[PDB]
Symmetry: C3
Subunit: 151 residues, 3 copies
């Protein structure tokens, strides 16, 4: 019976914590983040070449944005539109030209290539950017694009 | 007893979350947030016209800053001062000239109008801005002001 | 019954632990660094010392006060990322040649650049940290990156 008092008390504490956490999470995502499902995109708000962007996300405990569905892509698109800057995705075909993979080596399960893409322009486009319209284009890894990580 | 031991373990886990979260609350609100009572204001740090500002807030699960007491208004003022940029509030008299309402249609429970305001200058001021001195002025919705949401 | 409520509570706490851990990463990116029990966060802009100090105290923290090589290296990452030297909390405003924390305590760790502190011009009572992590005394009226600790 004293255990029941403790349980009822802990239940109230945990629910107040859930409520505070939920509020702080909305605050956290405004205006540089987007949640979609269990994934959270957050932009750093500046641009970097791919290798540097990739390092920022991994050091932060995440990875570069990797939309795996239309819904994820739409969420990511909101951030790009808000910053009005194309962003890098995580995926590259550096290992095998024409074959884009996630950092793990897995093949794409979703893509949203703009018409005519990916075209490996100049013979050297192995990174991927997402435009303000949400479509993707292969782009040289040395160009600077908005940094958006996923967690 | 096992139920007892489970409750004790939960107690320890909850204490740890409360303590860890309490620190992150402070970190999160620096430098663009302000907590007051159960409300949190958060600025995007940039300016937009009203309609755009309102959409940003509502899409983020909030609404434009709606100070409902002197205490809230002072907390909001601290952000406005820090950014040195007047901000939009949520309230308008777009529906009925002279009758300012919250986005829910409720009439105002607090106001801090500068002397002689609102004055519907030019016959077309239906939004409200808050100055760095904390006072309110009705202003054209088309103008660009600091975006500050409440959560 | 009780055993059921406990089970549900267990689920709620495990969910919060996972959600909180994910949220911590989101929060610290890109302007924060966690080191031990301390968190540094930069505002991403520069201010003169008095203004920087007030921003930190009103936010419920204080200016970055690295107390070990580990803390200094963590702080240094933010400085390197913004490519902007930052103010520390410590000053010798009260007693020239003696730098103290905002409490009044004397320094328990330092990382002065060679020759520093040198009170150049007879008026350097604040401290900046460079992208190389070394410290230099500097006029309090100059504008440097604001970084607070919590
Ligand atoms: C859309 O812009 C064009 O040029 C860029 C690189 O500059 C390409 O990546 C792209 O596929 C097009 O050919
Ligand atoms: C300086 O402020 C004046 O003009 C603006 C519009 O420019 C008004 O909203 C205000 O009430 C005053 O008439
Ligand atoms: C370039 O560095 C020198 O000048 C600055 C600015 O005055 C001093 O703080 C420093 O100790 C050196 O004398
Ligand atoms: Ca190639
Ligand atoms: Ca290629
Ligand atoms: Ca291309
Ligand atoms: Ca009108
Ligand atoms: Ca009006
Ligand atoms: Ca007016
Ligand atoms: Ca002195
Ligand atoms: Ca000095
Ligand atoms: Ca010096």
């Amino acid at each position: 019976a004293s255990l029941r008092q403790q349980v009822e008390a802990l239940q109230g504490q945990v629910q107040h914590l859930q409520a505070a956490f939920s509020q702080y999470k909305k605050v956290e995502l405004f205006p540089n983040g987007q949640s979609v499902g269990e994934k959270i995109f957050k932009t750093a708000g500046f641009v970097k070449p791919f290798t540097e962007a990739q390092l920022l996300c991994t050091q932060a405990g995440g990875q570069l944005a990797s939309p795996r569905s239309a819904a994820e892509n739409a969420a990511l698109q909101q951030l790009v539109v808000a910053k009005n800057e194309a962003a890098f995705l995580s995926m590259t075909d550096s290992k095998t030209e024409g074959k884009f993979t996630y950092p793990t080596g897995e093949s794409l399960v979703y893509s949203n290539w703009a018409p005519g893409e990916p075209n490996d322009d100049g013979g050297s486009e192995d990174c991927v950017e997402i435009f303000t319209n949400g479509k993707w284009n292969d782009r040289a890894c040395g160009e600077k694009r908005l940094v958006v990580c996923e967690f």
